[PDB]
């Protein structure tokens, strides 16, 4: 990825995008439609990925 955008609200995230090694997590933002690199070890990301994997 790169660096990690700091303090991005969860409600501002449309969806997450995991890249194939070019963890690489990218968040699509709702207010400005940008793609931002998210920090993988944030608590709310780990819980988001669980809901998707049905766990």
């Amino acid at each position, epitope marked *: 990825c790169r660096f990690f*955008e700091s*303090h*991005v*609200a*969860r*409600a*501002n995230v449309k969806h997450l995008k995991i890249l194939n090694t070019p963890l690489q997590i990218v968040a699509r*933002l*709702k*207010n*400005n*439609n*940008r793609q*931002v690199c998210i920090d993988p070890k944030l608590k709310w990301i780990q819980e988001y990925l669980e809901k998707a994997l049905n766990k």
Partner: antibody, heavy 120, light 108 residues
Framework: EVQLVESGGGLVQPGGSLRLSCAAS????????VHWVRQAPGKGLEWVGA???????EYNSNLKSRFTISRDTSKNTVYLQMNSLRAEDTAVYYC??????????????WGQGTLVTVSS | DIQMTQSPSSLSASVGDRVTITCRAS??????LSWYQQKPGKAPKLLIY???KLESGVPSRFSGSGSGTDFTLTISSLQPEDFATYYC?????????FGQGTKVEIKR
């Protein structure tokens, strides 16, 4: 030079309907998101819903979808359709531009506000 | 639904007094909290975003701190034009929710 102007405020009967406007200049709705906020007279602030530049819509779930947010990019104007109003819907209705920072939704530019009164 | 709560509801201090306003969230909101100033008959004016960031044009006598469920807005030196109701807004989750406001009066 960003300027938001509301209009369409006025008296409505209970169970009645109304539409508001928000003409934006100095910036494009294609780049910036716009939000509706209402404030009952002498009360607190209430986030109605959001209209993204992408652009879809986000609503406050407590409103029972009795409101509809819409956009006409060719006019660069945002609307709010109000349906089956109650007395509790009497409030000043602001529109505010989303600053568009990655942090989240932040209202940097506001309109003067328009007042909807629901009474028989 | 995250409900925001502020303390106190009202306060009266003198020109030049430090004043703080507490903002509590019913649930953790990280650093996604903002502060708004609203004068009578006017629209709210954004002061602090991201808990501690002061936006352009706002006098640095305003200051913010906090995280999680506890936040606080500090006016380090009260001015006569600080008369207003101060709201905190949470943008961590939808619906975005406001505090009920804090009324600041000037003693003279």
């Amino acid at each position: 030079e960003v300027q938001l102007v509301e209009s369409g405020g006025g008296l409505v009967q209970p169970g009645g309907s109304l539409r508001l406007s928000c003409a934006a200049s100095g910036f494009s709705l294609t780049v910036y998101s716009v939000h509706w906020v209402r404030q009952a007279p002498g009360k607190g602030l209430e986030w109605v819903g959001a209209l993204w530049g992408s652009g879809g819509t986000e609503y406050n779930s407590n409103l029972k979808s009795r409101f509809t947010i819409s956009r006409d990019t060719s006019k660069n104007t945002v609307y709010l359709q109000m349906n089956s109003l109650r007395a509790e819907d009497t409030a000043v209705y602001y529109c505010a531009r989303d600053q568009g920072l990655n942090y989240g939704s932040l209202f940097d530019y506001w309109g003067q506000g328009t007042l909807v009164t629901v009474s028989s | 639904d995250i409900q925001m709560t502020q303390s106190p509801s009202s306060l009266s201090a003198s020109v030049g007094d430090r004043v703080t306003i507490t903002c509590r969230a019913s649930e953790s909101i990280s650093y996604s909290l903002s502060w708004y100033q609203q004068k009578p008959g006017k629209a709210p004016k954004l002061l602090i975003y991201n808990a501690v960031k002061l936006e352009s044009g706002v006098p640095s006598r305003f200051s913010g701190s906090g995280s999680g469920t506890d936040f606080t807005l500090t006016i380090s030196s009260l001015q006569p034009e600080d008369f207003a109701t101060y709201y905190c807004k949470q943008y961590w989750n939808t619906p975005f929710t406001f505090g009920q406001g804090t009324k600041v009066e000037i003693k003279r």
